[PDB]
């Protein structure tokens, strides 16, 4: 299967605080594996997977030193953004960054990413070519001009095509068991009477989170008049979802629920069972 690595960084300033708080989180195959937070006493990158604790002491110090550098980089960026957008002091502001590597089932790079957001909105992003920048906002043109003239791009391209890839290979070998294993969805239908009956199709114990539930009546997926919930974590590393339809009591068993998930050998089909 295909693999990924990302680093989500945030700096937040608030109308009380003097200095922004900076937080960085790493993920491998969409699972958190490292975290740093400037609000902790002795701020440090610390592991979040049993398979990462295996890494040595000098690995941990190196990372921490990077985080400290990032913190300053974000602090100065936040101050400049207030000017770029003519924001008077005494509000809350946020600056976010996503960066990382995507790899195919062959372990070769598919794509690098590098994107920034201000106030939760796109500010500037490195395009897929890893050479040019997209920036929509008028204010963001200031940044795009600086970076165009500086080989910011070549810096990030070297990281995304190099270190990001090599370390992801390292990490993948080490924590091979947690990450490769998918959990197929276990599904069932529950019954809830009404004026009319409510069929609720459940999917439980699945990983990763992407899943699709449909309801069918004589071969037609029922678009409107189907309720559902957003996919949600059980808290044990699996996820849940359900989809309900309202059908006449006695027209039960003419309805079939379908669950599509990457862990299944094929889609599951289910009906109401007494």
């Amino acid at each position: 299967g295909p693999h990924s690595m990302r680093y989500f960084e945030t700096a937040v300033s608030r109308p009380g605080l003097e200095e922004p708080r900076y937080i960085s989180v790493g993920y491998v195959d969409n699972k958190e594996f490292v975290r740093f937070d400037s609000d902790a006493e002795n701020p440090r990158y610390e592991p979040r997977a049993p398979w990462m604790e295996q890494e040595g002491p000098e690995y941990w110090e190196r990372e921490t030193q990077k985080a400290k550098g990032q913190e300053q980089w974000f602090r100065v960026s936040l101050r400049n953004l207030l000017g770029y957008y003519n924001q008077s002091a005494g509000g809350s502001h946020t600056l976010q960054q996503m960066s990382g590597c995507d790899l195919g089932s062959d372990w070769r790079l598919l794509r690098g990413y590098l994107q920034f957001a201000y106030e939760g909105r796109d500010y500037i992003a490195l395009n897929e070519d890893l050479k040019t920048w997209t920036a929509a906002d008028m204010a963001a043109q200031i940044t795009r001009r600086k970076w165009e003239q500086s080989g910011a791009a070549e810096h990030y391209k070297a990281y995304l095509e190099g270190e990001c890839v090599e370390w992801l290979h390292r990490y993948l070998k080490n924590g091979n068991a947690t990450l490769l294993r998918t959990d197929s969805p276990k599904a069932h239908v529950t019954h809830h009477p009404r004026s009319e009956v409510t069929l609720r199709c459940w999917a439980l114990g699945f990983y990763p989170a992407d899943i699709t539930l449909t309801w069918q009546l004589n071969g037609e997926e029922l678009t409107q008049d189907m309720e559902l919930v957003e996919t949600r974590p059980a808290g044990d590393g699996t996820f849940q979802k359900w989809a309900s339809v309202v059908v006449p009591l006695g027209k039960e068993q003419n309805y079939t629920c379908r669950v599509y998930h990457e862990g299944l050998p094929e889609p599951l089909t289910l009906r109401w069972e007494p």
């Binding site: 680093y7 960085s24 790493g26 490292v34 990158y45 990372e63 990077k66 985080a67 550098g69 990032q70 980089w73 960054q97 960066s99 970076w147 500086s150 910011a152 810096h155 990030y156 990281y159 270190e163 990001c164 090599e166 370390w167």
Partner: peptide, 7 residues
């Protein structure tokens, strides 16, 4: 392995 932003 975290990134370090371009100064």
């Amino acid at each position: 392995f975290a990134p370090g932003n371009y100064p």
